């Protein structure tokens, strides 16, 4: 029948989760933001809206540093992106503290995926 | 409840009228085994403080990666972490005194003497001190284990009350780090002639001094030392 796209962990009848398709919409919502990888590096840009003469510059900063080599930038749900944060934070102190090399970026990037993909599952 | 196994000798220091200096000499013993030649247990954070740490040395690397963590998140969500709201000496103390105490009251000490050095961002001296049981002070000279009992008398000869300090310079308070140094290689069994010196000057910012050795050293006199008391030759 209907009513596939109620609920989080729920394949719709062509295989399908409606509410990470819909929390998609929240980020096309969201204000823009790139990364570009040069030969040795890697830079990361965000589009801050000024809605009024009364917010502070640059006082209201978006991209996120995880340990000492890892930039983060994010678009859409702001708290969202802040928790996500958050959590490659502890990840790549627990790796950093167990491991003694800092994380890895695909270990580091494999370390969100398996967070992200979790909150699609239940 | 532990019991210390690899070992770091005194930790001495005073405060001079402009910053703080902190001396430790380069050595891990093991037991009466003296096992370790390379170990720095000067530890700098940031460049307004070092920390200097005696006792158990697996306890000091712990306490050492603490601080490497401290200072990455402390730059977490901060464009100020390269002033106002950089890491102060003062901070990174009560930090280390309040896992000092905690441990002692878990009954699993962190088995080690602590002395924070440094100076803050108004330009006034740092220096206070910690050990495993969360027990803290400060003076104008400070130090551990037999640098308590030999440096200390030493060092309060130069700086003996808080009025001396302004009159004290880097040269003098220098000089006397140094010649402590060589009286408790002279007298310390548990330590060594390498050692590293860490000056933190309000002006010139933080110097540190590694593979400095023990000179100018009397043993002359041993020549005419015969004998236990009646051996003539």
Same mark, same amino acid.
């Given at each position: 029948?209907? $009513?596939?796209?109620?609920?989080?962990?729920?394949?719709?009848?062509? $295989?399908?989760?409606?509410?990470?398709?819909?929390?998609?919409?929240?980020?096309?919502? $969201?204000?823009?933001?790139?990364?570009?990888?040069?030969?040795?590096?890697?830079?990361?840009?965000?589009?801050?809206?000024?809605?009024?003469?009364?917010?502070?510059?640059?006082?209201?900063?978006?991209?996120?540093?995880?340990?000492?080599?890892?930039?983060?930038?994010?678009? $859409?749900?702001?708290?969202? !992106?802040?928790?996500?944060?958050?959590?490659?934070?502890?990840?790549?102190?627990?790796?950093?503290?167990?491991?003694?090399?800092?994380?890895?970026?695909?270990?580091?990037?494999?370390?969100? !995926?398996?967070?992200?993909?979790?909150?699609?599952?239940? | 409840?532990?019991?210390?196994?690899? &070992?770091?000798?005194?930790?001495?220091?005073?405060?001079?009228?402009?910053?703080?200096?902190?001396?430790? *000499?380069?050595?891990?013993?093991?037991?009466?085994?003296?096992?370790?030649?390379?170990?720095?247990?000067?530890?700098?954070?940031?460049?307004?403080?070092?920390?200097?740490?005696?006792?158990?040395?697996?306890?000091?690397?712990?306490?050492?990666?603490?601080?490497?963590?401290?200072? &990455?998140?402390?730059?977490? *969500?901060?464009?100020?972490?390269?002033?106002?709201?950089?890491?102060?000496?003062?901070?990174?103390?009560?930090?280390?005194?309040?896992?000092?105490? +905690?441990?002692?009251?878990?009954?699993?000490?962190? @088995?080690?003497?602590?002395?924070?050095?440094?100076? +803050?961002?108004?330009?006034?001296?740092?220096?206070?001190?910690?050990?495993?049981?969360?027990?803290?002070?400060?003076?104008?000279?400070?130090?551990?284990?037999?640098?308590?009992?030999?440096?200390?008398?030493?060092?309060?000869?130069?700086?003996?009350?808080?009025?001396?300090?302004?009159?004290?310079?880097?040269?003098?308070?220098?000089?006397?780090?140094?010649?402590?140094?060589?009286?408790?290689?002279?007298?310390?069994?548990?330590?060594?002639?390498?050692?590293?010196?860490?000056?933190?000057?309000?002006?010139?910012?933080? &110097?540190?001094?590694?593979?400095?050795?023990?000179?100018?050293?009397? @043993?002359?006199?041993?020549?005419?030392?015969?004998?236990?008391? &009646? +051996?003539?030759?």
């Amino acid at each position: 029948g209907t $009513g596939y796209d109620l609920s989080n962990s729920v394949f719709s009848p062509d $295989g399908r989760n409606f509410q990470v398709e819909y929390a998609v919409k929240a980020v096309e919502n $969201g204000t823009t933001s790139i990364g570009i990888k040069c030969n040795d590096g890697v830079v990361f840009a965000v589009e801050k809206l000024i809605t009024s003469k009364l917010l502070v510059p640059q006082k209201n900063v978006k991209i996120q540093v995880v340990d000492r080599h890892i930039g983060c930038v994010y678009s $859409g749900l702001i708290p969202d !992106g802040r928790h996500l944060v958050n959590r490659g934070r502890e990840e790549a102190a627990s790796f950093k503290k167990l491991y003694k090399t800092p994380i890895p970026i695909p270990a580091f990037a494999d370390r969100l !995926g398996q967070y992200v993909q979790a909150h699609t599952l239940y | 409840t532990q019991q210390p196994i690899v &070992t770091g000798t005194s930790v001495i220091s005073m405060k001079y009228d402009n910053g703080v200096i902190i001396a430790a *000499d380069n050595l891990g013993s093991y037991g009466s085994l003296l096992r370790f030649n390379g170990v720095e247990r000067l530890i700098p954070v940031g460049d307004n403080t070092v920390v200097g740490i005696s006792g158990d040395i697996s306890d000091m690397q712990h306490i050492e990666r603490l601080l490497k963590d401290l200072v &990455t998140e402390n730059a977490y *969500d901060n464009p100020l972490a390269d002033a106002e709201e950089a890491l102060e000496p003062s901070y990174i103390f009560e930090y280390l005194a309040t896992v000092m105490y +905690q441990r002692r009251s878990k009954m699993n000490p962190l @088995w080690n003497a602590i002395i924070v050095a440094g100076v +803050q961002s108004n330009g006034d001296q740092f220096l206070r001190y910690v050990n495993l049981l969360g027990v803290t002070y400060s003076s104008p000279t400070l130090a551990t284990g037999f640098g308590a009992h030999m440096a200390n008398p030493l060092l309060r000869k130069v700086v003996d009350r808080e009025s001396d300090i302004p009159k004290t310079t880097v040269q003098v308070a220098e000089e006397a780090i140094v010649n402590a140094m060589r009286v408790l290689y002279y007298r310390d069994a548990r330590s060594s002639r390498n050692f590293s010196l860490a000056i933190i000057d309000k002006n010139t910012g933080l &110097t540190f001094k590694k593979n400095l050795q023990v000179e100018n050293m009397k @043993w002359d006199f041993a020549k005419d030392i015969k004998g236990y008391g &009646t +051996q003539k030759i």
